[PDB]
Amino acid sequence: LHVPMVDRTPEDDPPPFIVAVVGPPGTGKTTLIRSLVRRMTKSTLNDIQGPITVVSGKHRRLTFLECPADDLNAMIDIAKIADLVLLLIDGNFGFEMETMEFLNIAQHHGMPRVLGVATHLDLFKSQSTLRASKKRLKHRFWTEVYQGAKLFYLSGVINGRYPDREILNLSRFISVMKFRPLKWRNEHPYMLADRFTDLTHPELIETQGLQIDRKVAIYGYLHGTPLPSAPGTRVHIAGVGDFSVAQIEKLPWNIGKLIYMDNISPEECIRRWRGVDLEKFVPYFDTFEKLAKKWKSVDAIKERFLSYVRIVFEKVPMEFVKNFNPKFPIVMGGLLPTEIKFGIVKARLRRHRWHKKILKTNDPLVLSLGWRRFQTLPIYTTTDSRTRTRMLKYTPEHTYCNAAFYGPLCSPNTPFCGVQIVANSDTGNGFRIAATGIVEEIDVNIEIVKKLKLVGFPYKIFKNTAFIKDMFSSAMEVARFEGAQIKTVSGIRGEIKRALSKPEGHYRAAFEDKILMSDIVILRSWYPVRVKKF
Amino acid sequence: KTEKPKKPKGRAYKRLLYTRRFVNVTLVNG
Amino acid sequence: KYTTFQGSQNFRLRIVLATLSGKPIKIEKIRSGDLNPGLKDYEVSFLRLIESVTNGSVIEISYTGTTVIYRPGIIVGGASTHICPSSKPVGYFVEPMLYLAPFSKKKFSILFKGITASHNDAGIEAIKWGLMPVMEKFGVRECALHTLKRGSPPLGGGEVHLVVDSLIAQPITMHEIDRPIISSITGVAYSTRVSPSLVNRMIDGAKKVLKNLQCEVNITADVWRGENSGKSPGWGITLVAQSKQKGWSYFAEDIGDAGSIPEELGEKVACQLLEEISKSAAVGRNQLPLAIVYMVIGKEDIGRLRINKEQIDERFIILLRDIKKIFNTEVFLKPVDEADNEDMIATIKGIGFTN
Amino acid sequence: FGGSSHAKGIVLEKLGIESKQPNSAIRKCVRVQLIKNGKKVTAFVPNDGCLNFVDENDEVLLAGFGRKGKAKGDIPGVRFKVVKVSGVSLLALWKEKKEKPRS
RNA sequence: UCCAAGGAAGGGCAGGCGCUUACCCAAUCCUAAUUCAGGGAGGUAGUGACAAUAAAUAACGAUACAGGGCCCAUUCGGGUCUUGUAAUUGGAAUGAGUACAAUGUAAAUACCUUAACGAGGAACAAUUGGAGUCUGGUCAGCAGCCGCG
């Protein structure tokens, strides 16, 4: 309620509005971008320099973003910072099991206002049967995924595309309908980059090499809670790593000054301002003659009763210069205290809809936590009695685990999205969604328990005079556990008496009934194995 | 969602029921 | 490790604010020129207490003791029991742990053994009456100090059970811009191993001074006799001025030693109390770091505390300098529109989750 | 209720209600403050668990039980049941037919 | 409202949300510099569970194995035996939909027709329910012996 309140007030025309065009690579996304900006600037500009600052008057300026459908990272990176989803669809999607999983990412990380745009349904359809298919898509999406969004249908008029009233309906929905607040986004300072300049402190043998990072001046506008408040704060560069900032630039008789002037002694602050340690809690007073004679009369207390940024970096290293490219959009985050730390985190999970596998504990998983993408081994555990007595081997449809792993710690219990990684040529989406959940709590130094099983198969048993035919081969083992308490999966406990110098399985023990002849007589509580760190 | 019902739809369900009813009826009256 | 400090000045405060900040610190050159260099006993033992109430923290101590490295961990705590040494009383240890009290995942239930009185640190009823309703003003619902036994100097023998129940994530923002009207004056006069009359003589020492005012003065006689009175005899007295509309307070305490006079003790605590009334706007100098620290670590908003010109001493200036060194949060004072007093208003941007 | 059929509210905390069948498996209850009235009303969630889905501190839609008051059985005096968190209708999240929003 | 700072100019209007609007004068009539053409006259497409309308998801044959099959009294027990499991297996019959043509003809869109295709269950993918003394899994809490949820 106050997290939406901090966002809207400084936001005005030079802070843009975030709009992404997301869709398949084959369709004319770029054509829709050109005809969309054809309405804004006068009638003829059909050249793409994206991302670029779109000056849409003094009322609302915007900035537009597209990303290719094969990039696994920035498809995630665009999803959490958006304020409008504009999806372009074909006449060939809807049960395509490998091309439309990003819908779940926008479902989980925060859904803004969404849009369906139908364009290739004219070159493919020629008859009255397109009307039932469009309404069929209205049965699927987006009317079922959110009640309160409009599915648009546009003509296929690829390059040569209209300026007329249909993008006045599109710019009607863009121009009028605004954004719903995203909770955990607006508690962080976060900024999209607009311009990007490389300052190298000109040519020297300490300017280029194998290890040289230079002063990058980056340029953009602010979003969320204010980042310029102090120099030398922290930041995250997506895909590259977490860094600090060196120097940030911003382009949109008094005791209160003398206290912060640290070349002045505090007795000179008191001395200039008019006219010893907190290890003594009780404050200073004068002598009893002075306070007594001074406070003989008590009259003196008788009323006392009834925008734009120019950000400087000393980063990043030389190998990212060789990964320079046209600006496939890059976003800056801001890390908080109790999240710069590392720790073991406990998080609730479940299995994901339109996913077709199972998850062992040894296959590492790619996790998106806030602004950070990290590969971590997801060791699962369950309780069965409001206390843990086992772990599991792979998270089923049967039960839904309590997952634990080690990485960056995240106190405010954020929602938690887990992608199984594929290559750039496996499905058609850069990831495929493995599981989703929520950070439940933070807990360092916890220890999982897996109860193994020493095996003894019964054959002929009575209560007091009890042997096991086949359970052991060493006598000194039983000599050590003679002070212990044994079991059976049926639930009538035993207590071993004495090894009796027979290391053949046969030895005398105790049960508080006679264990039955279709039972399994065992022993419990085995070694509490460690956590894989990565 | 369950894959449990396989049972027919519409008219074919009413035919089978009628046959079963007749069989049940033959016993008790006879 | 990199945030560097000097000497034993503000040792507990920099450990506590280092813990809440999550920033590692390094306090060096503690008592390098003194006869017994390095840390004292109570400083080492207090660092053991911080090692107890936390997890993941690492404290490194130099072999000469002059250099201390502090990396904090998460705040856990729980139920335990600490022994206090004879060099400092229990209130020296109850004093910093109130800051970390709501910010744990488990309730602070730690029993304390040690001396229960001194002339420099905090007493029992000072913490119970002067700190705990004031942290209840900042949004703590349930907090309690349970004295099992008292201990007079030099031997002590006191047990106080510290339990904090309510767990918040940040303090609520406070706006105290006006000087309150004090309702009544109460207080506690306790004693161990001695007469039931010298308590009444201390309360005579209060009634000689606080008789001229127009508020009621109602002071409780508290005599402990038996094993509850510890090993050593003694007597102490504590006064609290309370305002029942918003529930504000002020306090002053002192104990009497061997050969001292109970009536002059009562007049001394009374005159220091009225002196603390005159030096104040909203809280006392004894209540000042609690309010300043609680307004710093609140949620991200502007808060205001009316302070007086007498309350700004060197302790307050070094306090805000240490806040700038730890959290880098800055407070700004505006002169009030009144001309009767000379107060000014503290403006605080709360930290929230700012890095 | 105030006479109407439903009331929309906010989770404060998660309690513990257990069972005897099939064995001791936890059936739970949740604590919801009313938005419109401020009275604090408990509720029950009829399913296999589903405490996992909802959260602390989120938006629910309470609903009546249908007996003119009159709690069902050995759950003690609980009169109301939960239908919709975040507008997406728990039963649809129960099968798999929806995925829950961000909050 | 604009300003080159001289001066020049429109009448505060509709429309929409809050409860995406196109084509044509072929007919009727009117006008015509009028047997030419025009008409913000006129005519033709977009919009759909509060409702509601018809009926498709299969029809007919064949054989070898096999019977403690069904009903009434929850009972104690009694009356009536015409039964199903196997692709054993075979030919039929069709339109949901795919598509030229013509009619329609504001130029014209849809509608009335249509050769060409098109099934043995993965089919060409109905459901929301409801019970059920049913089957399974390591849980108060423990002995002199046997268990309970």
PDB file of C-alpha atoms in Angstrom, chain A residues 98 171 185 201 229 260 265 288 320 328 332 416 420 434 437 470 521 530:
ATOM      1  CA  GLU A  98       8.155 -26.244 -26.324  1.00  0.00           C
ATOM      2  CA  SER A 171      -2.399   3.287 -28.832  1.00  0.00           C
ATOM      3  CA  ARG A 185       9.841  -4.827  -7.594  1.00  0.00           C
ATOM      4  CA  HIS A 201      41.820   6.596 -19.898  1.00  0.00           C
ATOM      5  CA  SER A 229      21.490   8.777  -2.191  1.00  0.00           C
ATOM      6  CA  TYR A 260      29.051  16.269  10.599  1.00  0.00           C
ATOM      7  CA  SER A 265      36.112  18.309  18.399  1.00  0.00           C
ATOM      8  CA  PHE A 288      24.586  17.627  45.357  1.00  0.00           C
ATOM      9  CA  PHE A 320      33.112  -8.768 -22.000  1.00  0.00           C
ATOM     10  CA  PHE A 328      20.232  -6.826 -26.433  1.00  0.00           C
ATOM     11  CA  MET A 332      20.600  -3.053 -13.406  1.00  0.00           C
ATOM     12  CA  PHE A 416      11.044 -18.638  -6.263  1.00  0.00           C
ATOM     13  CA  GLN A 420      15.816 -26.552 -16.067  1.00  0.00           C
ATOM     14  CA  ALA A 434      11.214 -27.244 -13.914  1.00  0.00           C
ATOM     15  CA  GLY A 437       7.900 -22.098  -5.248  1.00  0.00           C
ATOM     16  CA  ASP A 470      20.023 -63.315   9.513  1.00  0.00           C
ATOM     17  CA  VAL A 521      13.166 -56.543  11.946  1.00  0.00           C
ATOM     18  CA  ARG A 530      26.281 -33.114   4.427  1.00  0.00           C
TER      19      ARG A 530
END
